[PDB]
Design a protein around this ligand. Structure first.
Ligand code: HEC
Length: 112
């Protein structure tokens, strides 16, 4: 699903916090090149909330279905999938429109 050319437009919503180029800086959140199909807590130089280290332990990977649930409500996601009731997420920003979600994902699949 998903027009990755509409997804690149949508992604402009993420750019205050994230960069998308390979080797790019960790501005507020981690750089997201390579995120697709990679583990949770994928960037070794970023200090993630413990909750993302615990999805990583459980072997969660960023599939199209897990990105879709996550970007809709990051905080509910990391509670659910970590199984840690005191789970925190520094993200918080949500996408609420389904077309937007599917399009953003289609563009994250182009970045490795
Ligand atoms: C716009 C639609 C986006 C998208 C596609 C992503 N975010 Fe963020 N994000 C932020 C923070 C501070 C983090 C780390 C959270 C913490 O450790 O508690 C993240 C993390 C991500 C991920 C997970 C990457 C991983 O390696 O597990 C993903 C897939 C992701 N984001 C996608 C901060 C921000 C924002 C700051 C206000 C904004 C806006 C976004 N993120 C927007 C998006």
């Amino acid at each position: 699903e998903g027009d990755a050319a509409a997804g690149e437009k949508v992604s402009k919503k993420c750019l205050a916090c994230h960069t998308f180029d390979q080797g790019g800086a960790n501005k507020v959140g981690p750089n997201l090149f390579g995120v697709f199909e990679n583990t949770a807590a994928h960037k070794d130089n970023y200090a993630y909330s413990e909750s993302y280290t615990e999805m990583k332990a459980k072997g969660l990977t960023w599939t199209e279905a897990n990105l879709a649930a996550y970007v809709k409500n990051p905080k509910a996601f990391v509670l659910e999938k970590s199984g840690d009731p005191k789970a925190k997420s520094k993200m918080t920003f949500k996408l609420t429109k389904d077309d937007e979600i599917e399009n953003v994902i289609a563009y994250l699949k182009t970045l490795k």
